[PDB]
């Protein structure tokens, strides 16, 4: 499944995507991505739209 990450950061804003077999695998990939880019925010996940959102 294609999962989407919506980033609403202080300095970095946009969207990116990743493919994974389940949501927990996608979460790990996106949490790594956020750490690598210095984003430290709060997360939500909406299973209906397969979209994660992170806001600082």
Swiss-Prot record:
Q: Where are the transmembrane segments?
A: none
Where it sits in the cell: the answer is: Secreted, Cell wall
Q: What is this protein's record name? A: Immunoglobulin G-binding protein G
